[PDB]
């Protein structure tokens, strides 16, 4: 594996390509509230929908702040297109920097996210234009590789993972057409099936605190090192992505929990999940929690891993329900296939395909077999979660 081509610093153009008549490039400043609102306005009405046009992702402004101003961020990688006359923001494409491990090679990359074009400008081949411009702005900052995730199949995916969904409020989900009433059943029965204990069971479980950063950082890195493709977390990245700052973030987006051993008081496990609503195109919102990063000391010894994950993740479900989330989403990546079925996650129609730009490596297993169902012998591949 390795880079596909070497970029000649000397030949990177200082000026962007031309755009469709009536439109112009605009760097976004997401520290400006009005511009943050503008991006929110665009995504809210024009971002990812399901195939049935029932749901649309509704990233919050707090989520956008958190996702796009992570450690090392640069406004130059928050790319917009405006209408010249009205000034309206009509397209976007964004990146943030991070380091990844691809089979034990560390790479400096940008994660690409929030590619969006206003419905009225679709199917004009603007996308390749947006991609080329953010590529140019990255090349200018000495970054020549990218990773991204997509719901559609494009050239040479590195992996594919299937979405799974654990109902927390089944009735709400049924109500908005997310979950159906199977057939011979009743609401009462579906509610019973999905009912969850009132309290967590794992001893020492508590909300992560800033004091936990160093030891969570070390445990996470050891755990993720067990995957061919993974995110190479720095200390600042643990602070940013994992510890919610209530004093400065009124709308919480990340929940993280640690298990502090009753005896050693060392943290021995942790898990986290984030808040991403969907607008119900027509109630008006599905409040979904997504599983994010987790780690357990048990990984390093088996089959105690499955057993430990069953404990932690059922606790994660309890905590999410307690925080009023409607559903708990997870993909077949990390060691997730160990617990999805047994904790009653239902298989989803959604598939997330993973891609690298300007880097060649063999395909990596995505937690499923050729039938697109979870497989314990198909893990160890994908250890990176994108938002
Ligand atoms: C070194 C640094 C490198 C940095 C860059 C690394 C590359 C990152 C790449 C971007 C990572 C994004 C990660 C995310 O954010 S995935 C999120 C994508 N956004 C959405 O799904 C929101 C809803 N949809 C839209 O806003 C539009 O439909 C979009 C913008 C998706 C397409 O607009 P439109 O429908 O009006 O099409 P077009 O006429 O302009 O262009 C048609 C071309 O676009 C290619 N296309 C379609 N969808 C995607 C897609 N999701 N990734 C990459 N390419 C895509 C398509 O194959 C076709 O090419 P092909 O040859 O026929 O021509
Ligand atoms: C409730 C709901 N709301 N929306 C908008 C949808 C599609 C559903 N139904 S879903 O929950 O079962 C679901 C989910 Cl979560 C996610 C994807 C999916 C597929 C491909 N790509 C992405 N992303 C683009 C890149 N950034 C990461 C997310 C998401 C598809 C489905 Cl179908």
Curated annotation (Swiss-Prot):
It is found in: Cytoplasm. This is Glycylpeptide N-tetradecanoyltransferase. The active site is at residue 387. Belongs to the NMT family. Tetradecanoyl-CoA binds at residues 115-117, 123-127. It is an enzyme of class 2 (transferase). Adds a myristoyl group to the N-terminal glycine residue of certain cellular proteins. One of its GO terms (molecular function) is glycylpeptide N-tetradecanoyltransferase activity. GO terms for cellular component: cytosol. Keywords: Acyltransferase, Cytoplasm, Transferase. It comes from Aspergillus fumigatus (strain ATCC MYA-4609 / CBS 101355 / FGSC A1100 / Af293) (Neosartorya fumigata). Its EC number is 2.3.1.97. It comes from the Eukaryota. It catalyses: N-terminal glycyl-[protein] + tetradecanoyl-CoA = N-tetradecanoylglycyl-[protein] + CoA + H(+). GO terms for biological process: protein localization to membrane. Monomer. The keyword Cytoplasm applies.
């Amino acid at each position: 594996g390795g880079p596909i081509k070497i970029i000649d610093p000397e030949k990177v153009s200082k000026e962007p390509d031309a755009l469709l008549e009536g439109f112009e490039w605009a760097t976004l400043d997401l520290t400006n509230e009005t511009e943050l609102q503008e991006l929110w306005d665009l995504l809210t009405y024009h971002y990812v929908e399901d195939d049935n046009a029932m749901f649309r992702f509704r990233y919050s402004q707090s989520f956008l702040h958190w996702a796009l101003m992570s450690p090392g961020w640069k406004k130059e990688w928050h790319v917009g297109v405006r209408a010249t006359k009205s000034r309206k923001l009509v397209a976007s494409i964004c990146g943030v920097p991070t380091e990844i491990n691809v089979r034990n090679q560390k790479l400096k990359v940008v994660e690409i996210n929030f590619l969006c074009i206003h419905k009225k400008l679709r199917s004009k081949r603007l996308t390749p234009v947006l991609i080329k411009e953010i590529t140019r702005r990255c090349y200018l900052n000495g970054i020549y590789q990218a990773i991204y995730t997509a719901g559609v199949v494009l050239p040479t995916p590195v992996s594919s993972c299937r979405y799974y969904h654990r109902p927390l409020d089944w009735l709400k989900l049924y109500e908005v057409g997310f979950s159906p009433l199977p057939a011979g059943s009743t609401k009462a029965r579906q509610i019973t099936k999905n009912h969850l204990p009132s309290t967590t069971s794992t001893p020492g479980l508590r909300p992560m605190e800033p004091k936990d950063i160093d030891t969570v950082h070390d445990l996470l890195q050891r755990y993720l090192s067990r995957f061919a493709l993974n995110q190479a977390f720095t200390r600042e990245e643990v602070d940013h992505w994992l510890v919610h700052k209530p004093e400065t973030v009124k709308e919480q987006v990340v929940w993280a929990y640690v298990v502090e051993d009753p005896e050693t008081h060392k943290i021995t496990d942790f898990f986290s999940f984030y808040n991403l609503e969907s607008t119900v195109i027509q109630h008006d919102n599905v409040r979904a929690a997504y599983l994010y990063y987790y780690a357990t000391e048990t990984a390093f010894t088996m089959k105690a891993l499955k057993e430990r994950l069953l404990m932690l993740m059922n606790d994660a479900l309890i905590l999410a329900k307690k925080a009023h989330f409607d559903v708990f989403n997870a993909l077949t990546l990390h060691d997730n296939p160990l617990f999805l079925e047994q904790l009653k996650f239902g298989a989803g129609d959604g598939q997330l395909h993973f891609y690298l730009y300007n880097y060649r490596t063999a395909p990596v297993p995505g937690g499923v077999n050729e039938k697109n169902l979870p497989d314990e012998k198909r893990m160890g591949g994908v250890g990176i979660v994108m938002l």
